[PDB]
Design a protein around this ligand. Structure first.
Ligand SMILES: [Ca+2]
Length: 185
């Protein structure tokens, strides 16, 4: 196998997602090659094919499909800083006044990914407001704001370096969206 299946399933598990309905996106690393992204169900055979061909690996975090209109709920808010010392990125949520992430993800690239997982799926309007407030308070990359946003998948390589994305600092904690709305301005 060209990927770590345990990390893939752990990513889905921590997001309380169902592999049968999870959407995979394979994106070519070099913009100038103008290679079409794959949009397909997440399966081991498809990830195997995309990784060995040279694609980077992503999943749609929200549930329902590939476009914003197809998303009916999202199980987590999440974000990343565009840059900054990596070690600083791991802990910088604390100085922002954010609660501790449910888990974090090392991508192999320039950013740590932070996730806060809710106990129940969140409808798109409520989720959209929480995600926007999270971006504002932390100063995250403002690109990652739409309900069909894809995020780097754990257990697959960052193709530029070969480093395999890894989940770390999982706590098991689940947040409540109403409580989160109070702590996020
Ligand atoms: Ca809790």
């Amino acid at each position: 196998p060209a990927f770590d299946r345990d990390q893939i399933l752990l990513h889905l598990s921590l997001l309380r997602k169902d592999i049968a309905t999870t959407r995979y996106r394979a994106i070519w690393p070099r913009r100038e090659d103008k290679v079409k992204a794959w949009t397909t169900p997440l399966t081991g055979a498809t990830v195997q094919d995309a990784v060995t061909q040279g694609f980077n690996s992503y999943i749609v975090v929200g549930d329902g499909g590939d476009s914003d209109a197809e998303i009916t709920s999202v199980n987590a808010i999440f974000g990343e800083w565009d840059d900054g010392d990596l070690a600083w990125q791991v802990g910088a949520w604390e100085a922002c006044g954010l609660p501790r992430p449910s888990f974090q993800l090392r991508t192999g690239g320039k950013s740590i990914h932070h996730y806060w997982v809710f106990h129940s799926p969140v409808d798109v309007p409520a989720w959209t407001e929480l995600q926007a407030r999270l971006i504002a308070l932390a100063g995250f990359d403002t690109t990652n704001r739409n309900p069909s946003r894809v995020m780097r998948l754990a257990g697959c390589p960052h193709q530029r370096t070969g480093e395999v994305a890894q989940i770390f600092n999982a706590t098991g904690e689940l947040y409540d969206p109403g409580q989160m709305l109070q702590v996020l301005p």
